[PDB]
C-alpha cells in the first residue's frame, strides 16, 4: 500500500521522539486560568477585591456603596444620599464635596 509516503499531516516522524505517543494525554489538559480559580461566589468577590485594590482613598470612598441604575439616575452613599442623574458633570464633584469637605451645623 502507501501510508508513510504522504506527508500532508502531522505524522509520527514530525514530533522528535516517536515514543512520546505513550503519554499522548498532556494535550488534553485544561490548564487553570490565572486569577479566581485559585480560590477553589467567593472567587468573584476575591477577584473583585483584587482589582478593587487599585483606587485612591477618596476615589475608593466614592465607590464604597456605589450603585448605578438602568435609566442612568445615580445613587451615592455617604458614610445622606446624593441621588442624581449621571452625565452632568457637577453632580460627581458634589459627591466629592460632602465626602472630603468639612460640613458642620454649629448649633
Amino acid at each position: 500500500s502507501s501510508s508513510s509516503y504522504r506527508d500532508s499531516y502531522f505524522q509520527y516522524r514530525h514530533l522528535p521522539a516517536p515514543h512520546h505517543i505513550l503519554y499522548a494525554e498532556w494535550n488534553q489538559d485544561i490548564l487553570a486560568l490565572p486569577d479566581e480559580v485559585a480560590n477553589i461566589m467567593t472567587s468573584e468577590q476575591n477577584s473583585n477585591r483584587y482589582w478593587n485594590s487599585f483606587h485612591d482613598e477618596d476615589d475608593w470612598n466614592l465607590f464604597n456603596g456605589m450603585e448605578l441604575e438602568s435609566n442612568g439616575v445615580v445613587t451615592f452613599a455617604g458614610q445622606e444620599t446624593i441621588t442624581g442623574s449621571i452625565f452632568d458633570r457637577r453632580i460627581t464633584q458634589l459627591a466629592y464635596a460632602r465626602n472630603n469637605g468639612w460640613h458642620e451645623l454649629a448649633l
Partner: protein
Amino acid sequence: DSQDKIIHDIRIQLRKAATELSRWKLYGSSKWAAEALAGLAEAIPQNGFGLSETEYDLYLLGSTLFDAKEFDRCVFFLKDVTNPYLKFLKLYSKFLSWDKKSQESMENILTTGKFTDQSNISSILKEINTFLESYEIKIDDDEADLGLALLYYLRGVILKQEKNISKAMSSFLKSLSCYSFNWSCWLELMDCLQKVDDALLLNNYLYQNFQFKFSENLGSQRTIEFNIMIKFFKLKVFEELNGQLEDYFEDLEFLLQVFPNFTFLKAYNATISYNNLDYVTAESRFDDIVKQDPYRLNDLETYSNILYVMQKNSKLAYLAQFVSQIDRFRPETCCIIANYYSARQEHEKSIMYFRRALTLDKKTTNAWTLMGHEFVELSNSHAAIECYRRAVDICPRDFKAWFGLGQAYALLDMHLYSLYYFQKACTLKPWDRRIWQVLGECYSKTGNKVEAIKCYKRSIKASQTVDQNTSIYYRLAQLYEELEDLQECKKFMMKCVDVEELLEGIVTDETVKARLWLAIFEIKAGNYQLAYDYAMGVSSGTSQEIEEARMLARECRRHM
C-alpha cells in the same frame, strides 16, 4: 578594519558549518550553527563532496531514510559502502537506532546510572577501528577531510557512553583539530569534564600543543586567539562548573561585539546575572529575549524560576498559559507550569507536573529538589525524604538536595538525625550565613551549647550586612546566659542594641527583648540612670513590651 575582515570570514565559515552538518543529518551542531549566523552582526550557494554518481544515489536513499526514523533500514542498504563520508552515516544510523531503542525500552525507570558508580555497543566501536586502519590517511595529515574528522566524533561519543573516559577527549580533540565549528562535538567534551582543575588541565592543552588543520579551515581562522568556540569554550565551561575565571572577561565583550543579536549569548549573559543572585538585572536581560524571541523553550526554565521568587502570580499566569500553548513535551514547559500551580497552593497537582517534567529529560536533576518541596507542604514527610535522596544519588555535589533533605528531618523532632545532612551541606557552600545559622539551632536543640557558640560566631562573619545580625546577637547572648556567665553576654548585648542606633532607629522586635533584658539587669547593678534611657527607647514595641518598660521606667525614676 581587522574586525570587519573577521566578520566577513565568519559568515563564509558558518555558511559552510551549517551546510555539511545539516547535510550529514546531525542537528546537535546544525541547529547551533544557523542561530549563530543569525545573530551575527550586520556588515551563490557553497557545496562540495567527493562522491561518485553511482554511490551518490545511495546517499539520497540513506539520507531520507534517516529522518524518516527508519534507521535500521538505512543500515541494511548502506552496508557495503566504503566511502568514509557514507561510512559515518551507516554507523551513526546504527548508533541512533540504539539510542532511540534504549529510550523506548526505559521510560518507567526515572533515575539513570549504575549502582557501583556494551557488547552491542562494542560492535559499532570495532567497525570504527577497522575502517579507520584500512583508510589511508588516519588523521595527523594536512589532507584530512571533514568526513574523517566527523568520524572521530562518533568514535569519541560512543566511547564515553561505555565510560571509557580519558580516551574520548583524545578523539574529540582530534576531531576538533581537523574540523572546528562542531558545537555538538563541544558539549560531549563538556559533559566529560568533572572538576575545575581538569578544566585548567585541558585549557592549557588547547593553547600550547593544539593547532587546527589550516588546510580544511579557512584563512584567518585557524589562529587560536581569533577563533570562536575557543572563546565560546571559555564562556560555557568556566561558568557552568562555576570555576575560576581566566581569559574570561576580554573574550566576553569580544563576543558581544561580534554577536549582538545572538539569542543564545544573551540568555547565557542573563543566566550569569541569575547565577550571581542578581535578579533585578537578569529580569531585564530575559525580557529582551521574550520580546525578541517569543518561542524559545531552552532557557526559560530560569525565567519562571525567577518569576516564582518574584511573586506576581498574575505575571506567572501569563507565562504558564503562553508557554503551554507552544507544546507540552519540552522539559521546561512542564516545569514552567509546575511553578505557577505551586504558587497557587495546589501542590497535589503541581507535584505531578514536576514528575512529568523530569520524565521527558532525566538530566534535569533540579526538578528533584522541587519535587520534594511540594511534598513538605502536603505534610507527607516520608514521601519527601526519598525525594531529596534521589537527587543526591544522581550527583553527590548538590547543595540544594542536601539542604532540602536536612530540613525535612528538621521539621520533625529529629534535630540530631538531621545534623549529618546539614553538616554535609556545609562543605558545599561554607560561605553562607543561612546554613551556619541553622547548624547552631540544631546544636542548640541538642544540648551542644559549647559547640553552638562557635557555630554562630562563624555565621556572624559570613553575613554581608550588619542588620541581619540582629537576630543572631540576641539568641547568641541567651546561650551565654545558660553557660552561667552573665558578664560575658553583656558584650554581645551591647552590640545588638547599638545596631538599632546605627540603623537610625530600626526598632526591631529582637532588639525589643534585648532592651527589656538589659534594663532588668541594670536594676540589679544599681545603675538606675543608665537603665532609664533603655526603657524609654523600647517604648514603641508590642503591648507587653511597652508596659514592661513603662513599669521599669517608673522603677528607675523612683531611685533616680
